[PDB]
Scaffold this active site. Structure first.
Site, PDB file in Angstrom:
ATOM      1  N   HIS B  13       0.871  -1.159   0.000  1.00 18.15           N
ATOM      2  CA  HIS B  13       0.000   0.000   0.000  1.00 18.15           C
ATOM      3  C   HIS B  13       0.919   1.222   0.000  1.00 18.15           C
ATOM      4  CE1 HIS B  13       0.628  -0.116   4.510  1.00 18.15           C
ATOM      5  NE2 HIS B  13       0.720  -1.398   4.218  1.00 18.15           N
ATOM      6  N   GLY B  14       0.377   2.373  -0.398  1.00 14.03           N
ATOM      7  CA  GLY B  14       1.141   3.607  -0.373  1.00 14.03           C
ATOM      8  C   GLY B  14       2.049   3.935  -1.526  1.00 14.03           C
ATOM      9  N   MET B  15       1.802   3.335  -2.681  1.00 11.34           N
ATOM     10  CA  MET B  15       2.589   3.573  -3.884  1.00 11.34           C
ATOM     11  C   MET B  15       1.803   4.383  -4.912  1.00 11.34           C
ATOM     12  SD  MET B  15       4.742   0.125  -4.633  1.00 11.34           S
ATOM     13  CE  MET B  15       3.221  -0.709  -4.923  1.00 11.34           C
ATOM     14  N   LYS B  17      -1.321   3.108  -6.151  1.00 10.27           N
ATOM     15  CA  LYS B  17      -1.972   2.153  -7.049  1.00 10.27           C
ATOM     16  C   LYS B  17      -3.405   2.504  -7.456  1.00 10.27           C
ATOM     17  CE  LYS B  17      -1.439  -1.117  -4.154  1.00 10.27           C
ATOM     18  NZ  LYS B  17      -2.825  -1.400  -4.583  1.00 10.27           N
ATOM     19  N   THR B  18      -4.245   2.845  -6.489  1.00 12.71           N
ATOM     20  CA  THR B  18      -5.638   3.173  -6.776  1.00 12.71           C
ATOM     21  C   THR B  18      -5.815   4.374  -7.723  1.00 12.71           C
ATOM     22  OG1 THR B  18      -6.006   4.634  -4.836  1.00 12.71           O
ATOM     23  CG2 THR B  18      -6.132   2.278  -4.516  1.00 12.71           C
ATOM     24  N   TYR B  52      -4.454  -2.125  12.294  1.00 12.66           N
ATOM     25  CA  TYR B  52      -3.332  -1.297  12.736  1.00 12.66           C
ATOM     26  C   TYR B  52      -3.225  -1.069  14.258  1.00 12.66           C
ATOM     27  CZ  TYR B  52      -2.297  -0.631   7.779  1.00 12.66           C
ATOM     28  OH  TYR B  52      -1.949  -0.843   6.481  1.00 12.66           O
ATOM     29  N   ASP B 107      -8.460  -3.722  -8.480  1.00  5.65           N
ATOM     30  CA  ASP B 107      -7.619  -3.099  -7.492  1.00  5.65           C
ATOM     31  C   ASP B 107      -7.337  -4.201  -6.446  1.00  5.65           C
ATOM     32  OD1 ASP B 107      -7.035  -1.623  -5.000  1.00  5.65           O
ATOM     33  OD2 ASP B 107      -7.282   0.086  -6.383  1.00  5.65           O
ATOM     34  N   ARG B 108      -6.144  -4.788  -6.525  1.00  9.34           N
ATOM     35  CA  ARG B 108      -5.681  -5.898  -5.683  1.00  9.34           C
ATOM     36  C   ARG B 108      -6.338  -7.203  -6.102  1.00  9.34           C
ATOM     37  NH1 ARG B 108      -2.868  -2.641  -1.732  1.00  9.34           N
ATOM     38  NH2 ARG B 108      -1.700  -4.599  -1.528  1.00  9.34           N
ATOM     39  N   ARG B 167      -4.832   5.433   5.674  1.00 11.55           N
ATOM     40  CA  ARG B 167      -6.211   4.957   5.497  1.00 11.55           C
ATOM     41  C   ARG B 167      -6.964   5.292   6.813  1.00 11.55           C
ATOM     42  NH1 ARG B 167      -6.821   2.114   0.408  1.00 11.55           N
ATOM     43  NH2 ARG B 167      -4.798   3.186   0.398  1.00 11.55           N
TER      44      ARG B 167
HETATM   45  O1  LIG Z   1      -5.469  -7.784   3.615  1.00 10.34           O
HETATM   46  C1  LIG Z   1      -5.313  -6.582   3.666  1.00 10.34           C
HETATM   47  N1  LIG Z   1      -4.732  -6.177   4.830  1.00 10.34           N
HETATM   48  C2  LIG Z   1      -4.409  -4.918   5.116  1.00 10.34           C
HETATM   49  O2  LIG Z   1      -3.850  -4.647   6.179  1.00 10.34           O
HETATM   50  N2  LIG Z   1      -4.729  -3.968   4.170  1.00 10.34           N
HETATM   51  C3  LIG Z   1      -4.374  -2.559   4.602  1.00 10.34           C
HETATM   52  C4  LIG Z   1      -3.392  -1.838   3.805  1.00 10.34           C
HETATM   53  C5  LIG Z   1      -3.817  -0.417   3.749  1.00 10.34           C
HETATM   54  O3  LIG Z   1      -3.714   0.140   4.977  1.00 10.34           O
HETATM   55  C6  LIG Z   1      -5.241  -0.612   3.670  1.00 10.34           C
HETATM   56  C7  LIG Z   1      -5.854  -0.676   2.376  1.00 10.34           C
HETATM   57  O4  LIG Z   1      -5.224  -1.739   1.661  1.00 10.34           O
HETATM   58  O5  LIG Z   1      -5.554  -1.885   4.283  1.00 10.34           O
HETATM   59  C8  LIG Z   1      -5.363  -4.299   2.967  1.00 10.34           C
HETATM   60  C9  LIG Z   1      -5.663  -5.575   2.643  1.00 10.34           C
HETATM   61  C10 LIG Z   1      -6.300  -5.942   1.432  1.00 10.34           C
HETATM   62  C11 LIG Z   1      -7.038  -5.152   0.621  1.00 10.34           C
HETATM   63  C12 LIG Z   1      -7.506  -5.802  -0.493  1.00 10.34           C
HETATM   64  C13 LIG Z   1      -7.137  -7.133  -0.631  1.00 10.34           C
HETATM   65 BR1  LIG Z   1      -7.358  -8.608  -1.775  1.00 10.34          BR
HETATM   66  S1  LIG Z   1      -6.160  -7.625   0.669  1.00 10.34           S
END
Ligand SMILES: O=c1[nH]c(=O)n([C@H]2C[C@H](O)[C@@H](CO)O2)cc1-c1ccc(Br)s1
Ligand SMILES: O=c1[nH]c(=O)n([C@H]2C[C@H](O)[C@@H](CO)O2)cc1-c1ccc(Br)s1
EC number: 2.7.1.21
Lengths: 300, 304
Positions: B13-15, B17-18, B52, B107-108, B167
């Site tokens: 996350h944080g690159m 992508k979305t 988190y 997206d993912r 997030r």
């Molecule tokens: O399994 C996950 N675990 C996780 O900690 N994240 C965190 C990262 C960032 O803070 C935020 C959005 O991705 O959520 C995301 C995911 C996933 C999102 C979509 C899929 Br498939 S898996």
């Protein structure tokens, strides 16, 4: 290619199942007890029953019970998950069978049946039950599920006789779990009879009434939009449930009899179960080794 | 017969992508966003906030490792539910590999929730490798034409962005960033490893471009005491899981995109890689519209 027969003996715990299958070119894949008590985690079964006991005593909340409960269902289906996974590619299209595989419980017990029962018990969010359903792998050809029939007090007597260590005689959980397999047996005839949940879903407001199918558990307030609608995410997970179950071949065994009899009956249903070819010459041997190595390592 | 082009944009996350995927889509091309409304409301309440905080609680020594694992495993089942339902609903239309009649910009990919995020949590000690391998066994069969674009971006430049792209309920956890960064690098190496003929069982003893060293792949995450028999060999339960980890990934098509460039740059960069990607036919000619609406609907209901 040579043919195989996969038979998954399934139903509620305490009906005398393991007993009668052990009384049966035929391998028996047991219940991965070592994987529950030791390999995956410490005493998974104990944890399940203890937790619910804490919820019943209100020593913890419906939500903490849900997470512990949720995290356990993972440990419980893992061995079944992987088996179906590694097994899947060798199974060919439907067709004496060169190998008969008797399994102790199908993966749906872990990804559908027990989760639902625990929901029914106020220990598993319906959101979680549907997450597991969404993960139910495609239904290989020739999947024969034997479910058991047994009078309640008779089954209570039985439940009483033998329980895995860590268990607790939970008569509600018995009724909860007997309810699910009962509904599950109903859902399958419904699906097979042409029933469409989307088309019959408004009724909740020759075949079983959708009120007597597994669909009726998901009229859960947490799954509906403020206007009563089911969220699409959830409507889809029911398309998976519908999709996965319709192709199963359910066979009923009356357990209200002697092991010799149950055994004699179990072998009896076999005359109408569906076989399938394997994918390679060496499928049978590979399958045979997997089922024996599974047994050896996880059956206690 | 019409074709389809599926593209899953994954990575730490944080690159950014979305953003770019939307950018790209703003140019027969439908997007399938992250299901935040499911994470914040529908499936559970504030799942990301939960994730988190837990790690954070564990790190503060305010809970244990077994509490985190129970919560984390629970949180991951929620996070990947929408992906899992989507994949299963779409799968029957996905046909043989073959301009695209429809382009679905996901997206993912399911594996992010069933593998990468779990694996990283494990590396963070809020998950057990047994649980990871449980998820791995649940990864669904890899559909034909599974094109995955992963995102590269130098660390410090990532840190800065992450610090920025938080997030709701997210905490700046660089440790998790590093973990998540390591796990995705292994995924790419692994897919390369598997494709250049690699076999983990064969190279087990050893724990674009040339075949990577098994120790530079995900197989190396699973060399844990927990998974070993007293005889020193992986128990077969796990060994068989790793067999599916390798089956699932061996047929994916990984592409790497550089995120160390402006939003319009990644858009054009990604738009470039897209041409060398595998498409596939759809099962019914009327599968396209259906696919179009499942995606739009997924978007309309869980996007936010
Ligand atoms: O399994 C996950 N675990 C996780 O900690 N994240 C965190 C990262 C960032 O803070 C935020 C959005 O991705 O959520 C995301 C995911 C996933 C999102 C979509 C899929 Br498939 S898996
Ligand atoms: O998921 C489960 N959850 C659960 O609580 N049980 C209970 C019932 C009994 O007390 C003991 C053995 O069946 O454990 C079983 C199962 C399953 C076992 C195998 C599969 Br697949 S699912």
């Amino acid at each position: 290619m040579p043919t195989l027969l996969r038979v998954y003996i399934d139903g509620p715990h305490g009906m005398g199942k393991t007993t009668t299958t052990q009384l049966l070119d035929i391998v028996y894949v047991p219940e991965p007890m070592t994987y529950w008590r030791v390999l995956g985690a410490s005493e998974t079964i104990a944890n399940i029953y203890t937790t619910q006991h804490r919820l019943d005593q209100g020593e913890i909340s419906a939500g903490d019970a849900a997470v512990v409960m949720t995290s356990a269902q993972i440990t419980m289906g893992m061995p079944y998950a992987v088996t179906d996974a590694v097994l899947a590619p060798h199974i060919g299209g439907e067709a004496p069978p060169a190998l008969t595989l008797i399994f102790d419980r199908h993966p749906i017990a872990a990804l559908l049946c027990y989760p639902a029962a625990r929901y029914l018990m106020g220990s598993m969010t319906p959101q979680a039950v549907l997450a597991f359903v969404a993960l139910i792998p495609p239904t290989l050809p020739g999947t024969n599920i034997v479910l058991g029939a047994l009078p309640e007090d008779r089954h209570i007597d039985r439940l009483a006789k033998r329980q895995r260590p860590g268990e607790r005689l939970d008569l509600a959980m018995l009724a909860a779990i007997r309810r699910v397999y009962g509904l599950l047996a109903n859902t399958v005839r419904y699906l097979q009879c042409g029933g469409s949940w989307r088309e019959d879903w408004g009724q909740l407001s020759p075949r079983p009434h959708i009120g007597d199918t597994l669909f009726t558990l998901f009229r859960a307030p947490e799954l509906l939009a403020p206007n009563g609608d089911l969220y699409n995410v959830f409507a889809w997970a029911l398309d998976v449930l519908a999709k996965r179950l319709r192709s199963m071949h359910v066979f009923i065994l009356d357990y209200d009899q002697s092991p010799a009899g149950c055994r004699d009956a179990l072998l009896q249903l076999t005359s109408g179960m569906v076989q399938t070819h394997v994918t390679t010459p060496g499928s049978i041997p590979t399958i045979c080794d997997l089922a024996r190595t599974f047994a050896r390592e996880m059956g206690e």
